Structure 1
Amino acid sequence: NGYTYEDYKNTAEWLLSHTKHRPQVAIICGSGLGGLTDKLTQAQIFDYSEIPNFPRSTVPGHAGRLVFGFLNGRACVMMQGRFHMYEGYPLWKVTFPVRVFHLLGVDTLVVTNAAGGLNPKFEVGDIMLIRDHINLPGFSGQNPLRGPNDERFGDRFPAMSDAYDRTMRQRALSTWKQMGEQRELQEGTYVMVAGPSFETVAECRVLQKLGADAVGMSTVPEVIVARHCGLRVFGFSLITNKVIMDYESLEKANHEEVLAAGKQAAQKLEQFVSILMASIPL
């Protein structure tokens, strides 16, 4: 890890003194879910590039910013654009924001992402609540906590079986009932793979066999660091596509489709997250 405790502190103190905003809930917007930033009131923007020690974006779209403000009663801080392992960032960089959020006073982390559907019941447009995750990179050594542990953040061996807040998931099923939607709020296990290339058929079959319902290349690391911090964690995935499971199919997974699905099912998530804010304690 190239960051010392002081680096986290310095980044927090800098932000704290550059905004009157004191966020309680940190929200990490997934792919095509950055619209959430529009609903924040008294929205103050910060380009990642101007924040000390922040991993400087590469060239996806060169748009990486932190937006503080209020979302339906809650003082938030939103990450529009997240860092992925496939871009070359080590996990201690990818999850650097999470630790900053913690020293800023945040106690809740909401993570969202786009994902391929492994569970055959899922349909494009669906919203899967994350009850658990399978951290494939972590089994091999790619765990954001690798390296010496700093007592100030958490313990050497944090548990993850209770990573996704039971309460918040129940309250989300409610908020969705109040939404009065045709499709029900899906729920399942999110498996993380590094990517960036998409899975082959044999691979989708493996991920299915392992018991995963959705697959993506992010989130798990932020969640582990969050939990290591003491943060309350709640999150969901937007099934942007059904991963190919047979060799007869003549369709391929593509960034085009994923962005399109994020485009249409857009505002639906935005409502759900905004309304969900009320369900979050303080």
Structure 2
Amino acid sequence: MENGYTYEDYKNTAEWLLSHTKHRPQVAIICGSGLGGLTDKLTQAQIFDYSEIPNFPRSTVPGHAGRLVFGFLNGRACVMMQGRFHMYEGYPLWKVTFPVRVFHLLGVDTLVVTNAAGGLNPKFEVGDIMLIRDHINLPGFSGQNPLRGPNDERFGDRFPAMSDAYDRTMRQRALSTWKQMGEQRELQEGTYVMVAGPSFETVAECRVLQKLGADAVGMSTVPEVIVARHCGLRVFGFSLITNKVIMDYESLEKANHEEVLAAGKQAAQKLEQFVSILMASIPL
């Protein structure tokens, strides 16, 4: 609606980093949060706190909005967001997604994003992993689109498509890796719907999200993919099911964050490895 950043601010944040860093990454990864441990498997790791990076979304205690790590993961030059920004935190989307536009100026050209999510598809099960074939951008329908505002042509068009958001190549490239390391549960595949804003859904709210044809649901991610494609990045992403969204009045259970962080933690290596391998089927 405004967008408080000019092209310059982006550039200036880039160049700064691009000069406290030997590194020049090609892929950006975004967790998770409980893909946290990933940071380990990197090597030659250089860390930064968001709080010291020019223009980053500042949170209240920094943070709470955490760290940017640069390094090598499976002999690929990475950079990853260990902790991210959300709309429910009160951040507008050109903030949430800000990081995303710096990455591209860094010359990263693939983005992988991950996240936890509730499962809407009855078939799914806590533990599973759903690749993201497509999304419903509900905040988007109503005005909340990280693209809203005057478009800067240096980044992209006024009117990008999202029909093809989630790289095809990568997605198979990908189920390979899944059995090509032999797993009991299959890879899932489906649609992430976004809703904002922090309260968990009602039962009726679930029924509606199932009707729309959604398979999983977070409050995340959605935004920063949309603006990845606005400027080229190939995009590949996926989701940890983490709870079966309560689907009927009767059940006495209740989503909590709690169970989410746990499951996230339980799932852990799974995962860390998965991404880690996948690195290898990203081009050059």
**Normalising by structure 2, what TM-score?**
0.98
8 Å CA contact 1:127–1:236 kept in 2: the answer is: yes
Deviation at 1:33, TM superposition (A): 1.2
Deviation at 1:36, TM superposition (A): 1.2
The 2-side partners of 1:32 and 1:16 are apart by 28
**What's the CA shift string for 1:206-254, capped at 9, x where partnerless?**
0000000000000011000100010000000000000001001000000
- Tell me the residue number matched to 2:173: 171
Deviation at 1:266, TM superposition (A): 1.0
Deviation at 1:195, TM superposition (A): 2.4
Deviation at 1:87, TM superposition (A): 0.2
Gap change, CA 1:224 and 1:113, over 3 Å in 2: same
Aligned CA-pair RMSD = 0.9
**What's the CA shift string for 1:75-114, capped at 9, x where partnerless?**
0001000000000000000000010000001000000000
The 1-side partners of 2:69 and 2:104 are apart by 16
8 Å CA contact 2:65–2:85 kept in 1: the answer is: no
The 2-side partners of 1:139 and 1:214 are apart by 18
Pick aligned residue for 2:98 from 96, 99, 105: 96
Partner of 1:229, secondary structure, is: coil
User: Is there any run of 5+ residues in structure 2 with no aligned partner, and where?
Assistant: none
The 2-side partners of 1:112 and 1:58 are apart by 24
Gap change, CA 1:3 and 1:61, over 3 Å in 2: closer
Partner of 2:46, secondary structure, is: strand
8 Å CA contact 2:51–2:63 kept in 1: the answer is: no
**What's the CA shift string for 1:156-175, capped at 9, x where partnerless?**
00000100000000011000
8 Å CA contact 1:48–1:57 kept in 2: the answer is: no
User: Is there any run of 5+ residues in structure 1 with no aligned partner, and where?
Assistant: none
Partner of 1:32, secondary structure, is: coil
The 1-side partners of 2:61 and 2:93 are apart by 19
8 Å CA contact 1:66–1:80 kept in 2: the answer is: yes
Gap change, CA 1:59 and 1:32, over 3 Å in 2: farther
Greater per-residue helix proportion: 1
8 Å CA contact 1:204–1:243 kept in 2: the answer is: yes
The 2-side partners of 1:252 and 1:107 are apart by 40
Deviation at 1:58, TM superposition (A): 3.0
Deviation at 1:38, TM superposition (A): 1.1
After the TM superposition, list the runs of 4 or more consecutive aligned residues in structure 1 that deviate by more than 2 angstroms: 57-63
Partner of 2:224, secondary structure, is: helix
8 Å CA contact 2:116–2:218 kept in 1: the answer is: yes
**What's the CA shift string for 1:17-76, capped at 9, x where partnerless?**
110100000000112111111111000000000000000123596351000000001000
Deviation at 1:178, TM superposition (A): 1.2
Partner of 1:87, secondary structure, is: coil
